[PDB]
Every structure is written in structure tokens, then in C-alpha cells.
């Protein structure tokens, strides 16, 4: 991979692997989410930021400040087949004191057509107390020289799905997947559960028949709290709807403390 000519975005090609594909011989949405995370990490390394998933400055490290995902929105049109080359372009934009946004465009390397797009909202937090804080100007200036100044949004639309409010699933849930625990493969280098694992746990409560007759088009996920290595998770889904829509809730098996919420949109094959 490499930063583009103007240095305000980063591009990378990936060949789809055998173990990365699902029952349709095409890459899974978790493989896509992993690839976005990989190109994001490579963009941060290419300009001097941390490579631990937090993309911090030396000023942030002294203060114990990190960047954490608040929302992740993905919309796939065509999942790449096993052996296909997929080119992903990524960039960041500051959204004031609220936080920053990382966007992605996925294209077919052969045809050049856009096969998917993603957007994620990030917020600054003290890694020890988990307390949020609005971005300081001294930190803001360190990122501005690496982001486009004019707005560049992967989801420009006036009323787009990436910014819609998500409600809390009401009990009883129509479907459920109980007792989900992370293993060592689900942890990152800092021993935290990888953001992608939560996407897999959300999709576990989708019935197999839906998976076999439909394809995932859109997924919007709000992150509220971390699941520790020694925590157990309950995944809850309810149909809200050709197209099929679901409301999702991830909560801790014990007390029922919310860790995630979202919506998925599927379409008939």
C-alpha cells in the first residue's frame, strides 16, 4: 500500500484468501471489516501515528488518551470472490470537538467499480478511566495536516443510513444466541476484544435460513462498552420489516449491561 499523490488518503490492494470466504465462495463481512482495519492501521503507520489500533500522537500517549470506535457503518454491493483483488482507499476527517471520522471505498481492482463503502465515528477517551473528552486544539492540529480540508464523505446523501438513530431492542427478543465468549484469537496485541468480533457476535443471532437465502447489504453498529476477556455475551435479534431488516442488541449474560446495538439490512439472492 501507499498514500496517494496528494498524501491526504491511503490505498491498498488485497487478494481474497481461502479461509476468508463464506458459504457463497465470497469474502465474509468480518473479512471486509478486518481489511478496513488493516488499511487504517497502514495509513496511521505511513505518517507516524501509533499502530495499536488507537492511532495516537506522542501528546496523547503522555496523557493516556486513545481513540475508540463509537459507530461503524458498512454497505457492501458485491462481496469479492475467492482469489479476487480488492482495492480499498481510506482517509480521515475531523468533525470538531466531537471526534474524527475514518471513511473507506472498496473497489474491484479489475473493473474499477465501487463494490462497497464504510464510515466509522471515533471519540477520544482516557484509556484508564474510560472517561470521554472533547478534542483539544493542540491535538486537533496534529491530525489536520493529514486529512482533506474540503469535506470528503463516503456517504454524502442528504438522508443516509450511516447517521440514523438506533433504538434499544425490547424484551422478548425474537431470536437469540446465548453464552458467547471470546477466545485468544479474538484479542488484539493489547489483549482487548477486536472490534470485528462484535460484528460476528451481532450476526450470530440471525437465523441460518436468513443467511442461506439472503445477503447482508448494510450493517450499522453502535459501540457503548467493552466486553472484557473474561465476560460472557448474549446476542439478541428481532425482525423489524424482498428486503429484511433486523434490530440487534449485545448485552452481558449476567446483569444485562448493554455493550452494543445495531441494525442489518439483507436482500434476496
Ligand X SMILES: O=C(Nc1ccccc1)N1CCCC1
Q: Any idea what DSSP says for residue 149? A: S
User: x/- string (CB under 6 A) for ligand X, residues 1-40?
Assistant: ---------------------------------------x
CB of 27 to its own copies, least distance (A): 11
Choose, by CB under 6 A, the member of 225, 231, 240, 244 that binds ligand X: 225
Task: Answer with the entry of its own copies, ligand X, none that 68 interacts with (C-beta below 5 to 8 A by kind).
Answer: ligand X
Cβ proximity to ligand X: between 91 and 266 the closer is: 91
Choose, by CB under 8 A, the member of 169, 196, 233, 265 that binds its own copies: 196
Task: Answer with the entry of its own copies, ligand X, none that 147 interacts with (C-beta below 5 to 8 A by kind).
Answer: ligand X
Question: Count residues contacting ligand X (CB under 6 A)?
Answer: 24
Residue 40 and residue 169: Cα distance in Å, rounded? 31
192 noted as active-site residue: yes
Residues of this chain, 208-227, that bind its own copies according to CB under 8 A: 211
Choose, by CB under 8 A, the member of 49, 201, 223, 246 that binds its own copies: 201
Residues of this chain, 239-268, that bind ligand X according to CB under 6 A: none
- Sorted by sequence, the CB contacts under 8 Å of residue 19 that are 6+ apart come out as none
DSSP string, 70-131: EEEEEEESSPPBTT-EEEEEEEEEE-TTS-EEEEEEEEETTT--EEEEEEEEEEEEETTT--
CB of 120 to its own copies, least distance (A): 15
- Sorted by sequence, the CB contacts under 8 Å of residue 246 that are 6+ apart come out as 206, 237, 238, 239, 240, 263, 264, 266
CB of 19 to ligand X, least distance (A): 14
128 within 8 A of 61, measured Cβ to Cβ: no
260 noted as active-site residue: no
**231 near its own copies (CB under 8 A):** no
- Cis before residue 172, ω within 30 degrees of 0? yes
From residue 201, alpha-carbon distances to 139, 233, 259 in Å are 34, 8, 11
DSSP string, 35-57: HHHHHHHHHHHTTT--SSSS---
Q: Any idea what DSSP says for residue 163? A: G
160 noted as active-site residue: no
Strand 258-268 with 214-223, pairing: antiparallel
Choose, by CB under 8 A, the member of 4, 7, 25, 97 that binds its own copies: 25
Under the rule (CB under 8 A), what is the footprint of its own copies? 17-19, 21-25, 28, 30, 34, 37-38, 41-42, 51, 53, 82, 179-181, 183-185, 187-191, 194, 196, 200-201, 203-204, 211
- Please give the positions annotated as active site: 190, 192, 227
Kindly list the residues in this chain that would bind ligand X in the complex (CB under 6 A).
40, 43-44, 47, 49, 55, 67-70, 92, 100, 102, 122-123, 132, 143, 146-147, 195, 223-226
Amino acid at each position: 500500500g501507499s498514500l496517494t499523490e496528494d498524501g491526504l488518503s491511503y490505498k491498498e490492494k488485497f487478494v481474497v484468501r481461502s479461509y476468508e470466504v463464506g458459504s457463497n465462495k465470497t469474502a465474509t463481512v468480518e473479512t471486509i471489516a478486518n481489511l478496513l482495519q488493516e488499511v487504517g492501521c497502514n495509513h496511521a503507520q505511513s505518517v507516524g501515528f501509533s499502530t495499536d489500533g488507537f492511532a495516537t500522537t506522542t501528546t496523547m500517549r503522555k496523557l493516556h488518551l486513545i481513540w475508540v470506535t463509537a459507530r461503524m457503518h458498512i454497505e457492501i454491493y458485491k462481496y469479492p470472490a475467492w482469489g479476487d483483488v480488492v482495492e480499498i482507499e481510506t482517509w480521515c476527517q475531523s468533525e470538531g470537538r466531537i471526534g474524527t471520522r475514518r471513511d473507506w471505498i472498496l473497489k474491484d481492482s479489475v473493473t474499477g467499480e465501487v463494490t462497497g463503502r464504510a464510515t466509522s465515528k471515533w471519540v477520544m477517551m482516557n484509556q484508564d478511566t474510560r472517561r470521554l473528552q472533547k478534542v483539544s486544539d493542540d491535538v486537533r492540529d496534529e491530525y489536520l495536516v493529514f486529512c482533506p480540508q474540503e469535506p470528503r464523505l463516503a456517504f454524502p446523501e442528504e438522508n443516509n443510513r450511516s447517521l440514523k438513530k438506533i433504538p434499544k431492542l425490547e424484551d422478548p427478543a425474537q431470536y437469540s444466541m446465548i453464552g458467547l465468549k471470546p477466545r485468544r484469537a479474538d484479542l488484539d496485541m493489547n489483549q482487548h476484544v477486536n472490534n470485528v468480533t462484535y460484528i460476528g457476535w451481532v450476526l450470530e443471532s440471525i437465523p441460518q435460513e436468513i443467511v442461506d437465502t439472503h445477503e447482508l447489504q448494510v450493517i450499522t453498529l453502535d459501540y457503548r462498552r467493552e466486553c472484557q476477556q473474561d465476560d460472557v455475551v448474549d446476542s439478541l435479534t428481532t425482525t423489524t420489516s424482498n428486503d429484511s431488516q433486523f434490530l440487534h442488541l449485545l448485552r452481558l449474560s449476567g446483569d444485562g449491561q448493554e455493550i452494543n446495538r445495531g441494525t442489518t439490512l439483507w436482500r434476496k439472492k
